[PDB]
UniProtKB/Swiss-Prot annotation, chains A, B, C, D:
Chain positions found as N-acetylserine: 1
Cellular localisation: Cytoplasmic vesicle, Autophagosome; Cytoplasm; Autolysosome
UniProt cross-references to PANTHER family, sorted A to Z: FERRITIN, FERRITIN LIGHT CHAIN
Record keywords: Acetylation, Cytoplasm, Cytoplasmic vesicle, Iron, Iron storage, Lysosome, Metal-binding
Origin organism lineage: Eukaryota, Metazoa, Chordata, Craniata, Vertebrata
Alphabetical GO biological process terms: intracellular iron ion homeostasis; iron ion transport
Quaternary structure annotation from Swiss-Prot or TrEMBL: Oligomer of 24 subunits. There are two types of subunits: L (light) chain and H (heavy) chain. The major chain can be light or heavy, depending on the species and tissue type. The functional molecule forms a roughly spherical shell with a diameter of 12 nm and contains a central cavity into which the insoluble mineral iron core is deposited. Interacts with NCOA4.
Domain Ferritin-like diiron: 6-155
One family name in Pfam for this protein: Ferritin
Purpose of the protein: Stores iron in a soluble, non-toxic, readily available form. Important for iron homeostasis. Iron is taken up in the ferrous form and deposited as ferric hydroxides after oxidation. Also plays a role in delivery of iron to cells. Mediates iron uptake in capsule cells of the developing kidney. Delivery to lysosomes by the cargo receptor NCOA4 for autophagic degradation and release or iron.
One Gene Ontology CC term in the entry: autophagosome
Protein name per the record: Ferritin light chain
Source species of the chain: Equus caballus
């Protein structure tokens, strides 16, 4: 093992590699979400831009994990990326539910890794997660919950019109 | 024939003149679309501006074909311009369908002319179409499809209100 | 199929989806190349930055294919992304050979798709490839060949010192 | 004890004083490293500047610990500073190994103090270490590992020439 590696367990190393995979899979899911909303028969540009920016954020998350892995003297291992769970994502409401579910799985993986670092007495790992991932997920998920609430309120009224209004007046375009 | 004319078939020359006519007819259709939406009893300014800008684009297309015709040593021939297929264009939805149909006819004429240039081994013609017309039509038609989808979604909900919202929140004014 | 789709064969649609997959796989290969060179026991920063920028370029390629797919009225389908062919990439020389091999596979897939568009008389497809992919690959591959030559010349002399000099004096850091 | 002191154990107080001593000793080691490389018969200016900047960083570390000690109502106690372990530091490679060893001892003392704060339920201490010391050491040690790798690769080739190239092309001067 590495000349620099110190207080860095194999359990944490491997879990960091799994987390990289989860983040790249999320990024890929968000790419598929974004381009679904760009279809001519869906055509909600602000929704497309929302999911494409999330694709970027998740890729950046992964990259940040990989940088850390190298900083600790671990070794990055890449595995196959599973395709997104759906080919078509339904309405804005369906999509935003799927996104929240996804984020909550990432958040749980983050919390599991934190618990691992704590069990291994790896405070650098814990600090790294706290500083760059945990707060960001909480803020993201809150934002998604808020969006969901606003979508629900809109489409309960009139589904088509509601979706158009959300995209125009809440989402960036 | 011309001192400069080289690898420029009469078949292509004539088809370029027909394409100029199609483009000027489209321009004229779009003028009629634009001013319909400016009527006091229709009064959707953003729709009027959308179709007037398309009138301009099609005129520019024609002008660009005529410039090319002269560059190749062909001779521009003008024929009568047929009036637009309708005097009244119905709703925003009806209008946007009519526009897509029109664009798809232009696009097909572009593809037919490209196939002609290829059969005649006229790579300058093909390149000219590729560079200035084919990509532009594809982008336009996609934009129109997107608009149509958004109009459909809006007016399925409530026809009058939907149309007003589209014009205010998607179209430039 | 789509309201906008015109002269867009299912053969081309499917091949565009396969090309997206190839590009995202290349992007992922380049991510693994980049982070290998960031390991404490490899530590060639300019090499890492070279491969990370290529990761970005390939992702952008894919995104550009997906945008086009939607513009034509095709439907994006995502499949599993295969992990990179190696976990460790050897020397700068080995890595640059692997990269050239990869680029040449992309280039061949581009040429195959071009031949398909030509057989299907899809000039928009051909133009799209010509404009955004074919020239870029040729330029890239030439650059990689040049790098390879310079690496070979350097490491034939003294392997370690040569590699350090290439990274410092040719690569950006 | 102090009017302000709260949740601040004597065990932590004393360990903070020992850490100040370790940091000032490291600073002094780095002063000796820096000036060795400034000798007329060694004359590697970039190496001298690298170690002098590290001397400064370690002094700043100590100062930051002392500030914190006072903030918590502890009392700073100074002890003798042991001279550096060597009077002459050999090659750039030998020096960089010695530096990594030193940093890893500081890092271990940081981790031990963190474990102490955790055992004492002193979250302010833990946070203080996480925020200002743990990440910084990890980044430093990674940088030193990278340097070591590059030095090794260079001097395996030709010792004198390699050392000169590292100093000129990697180190700041
Ligand atoms: Cl372990
Ligand atoms: Cl799967
Ligand atoms: Cl913590
Ligand atoms: Cl002829
Ligand atoms: Cl008529
Ligand atoms: Cl051509
Ligand atoms: Cl077909
Ligand atoms: Cl595989
Ligand atoms: Cl072509
Ligand atoms: Cl106590
Ligand atoms: Cl001593
Ligand atoms: Cl903490």
């Amino acid at each position: 093992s590495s000349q620099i590696r110190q207080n860095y367990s194999t359990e944490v190393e491997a879990a960091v590699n799994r987390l990289v995979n989860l983040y790249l899979r999320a990024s890929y899911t968000y790419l598929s979400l974004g381009f679904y909303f760009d279809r001519d028969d869906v055509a909600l540009e602000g929704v497309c831009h929302f999911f494409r920016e999330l694709a970027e954020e998740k890729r950046e998350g992964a990259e940040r994990l990989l940088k850390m892995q190298n900083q600790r003297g671990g070794r990055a291992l890449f595995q196959d990326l599973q395709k997104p769970s759906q080919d078509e994502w339904g309405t804005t409401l369906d999509a935003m539910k799927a996104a929240i579910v996804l984020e909550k799985s990432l958040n749980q993986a983050l919390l599991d890794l934190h618990a691992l670092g704590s069990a291994q007495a790896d405070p650098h790992l814990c600090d790294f997660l706290e500083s760059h991932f945990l707060d960001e997920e909480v803020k993201l998920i809150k934002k998604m919950g808020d969006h969901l609430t606003n979508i629900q309120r809109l489409v309960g009224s009139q589904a088509g019109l509601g979706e158009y209004l959300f995209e125009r007046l809440t989402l960036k375009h």
